[PDB]
Design a protein around this ligand. Sequence first.
Ligand code: W1A
Length: 165
Amino acid sequence: SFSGYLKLTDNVYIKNADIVEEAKKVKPTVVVNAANVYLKHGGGVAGALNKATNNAMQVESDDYIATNGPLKVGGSCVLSGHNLAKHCLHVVGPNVNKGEDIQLLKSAYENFNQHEVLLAPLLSAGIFGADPIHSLRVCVDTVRTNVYLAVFDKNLYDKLVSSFL
Ligand SMILES: CS(=O)(=O)NCC1CCNCC1
């Protein structure tokens, strides 16, 4: 199972790790992708997860969008986890760099509650532009299922742990 995580709460755990490497190692039931409404996995966590699938995630995602249309900001869909996990839960957190409402971050994290255990990044963090300290607080106050957070940046991981209330 998951190794080397620091326990933050009864159900939230955190580790300084590359989520692709973490997924390839653990092969969790669910890996969360920091998706956008179009499932265009260009950069950030989405670009990295997609590249690890040799673009199979993008091919599957384009078929999903052609059939269903775009996701809502705060919404999600379950697709294959390919070589990373049994499933990938593509969750759309608000992108404050595209002027999206930060209030949607709680709705985005609520998607995690449909899965008993997940390997995930901090939603809306990184290139999505939100404060990762705020994202972690919304995560621990919203998610009730077991979430293993992978934070790529060591300096950000240290800041998150040292400022965790
Ligand atoms: C760690 S998890 O609860 O996400 N998955 C359970 C098993 C162990 C890891 N490989 C898949 C089977």
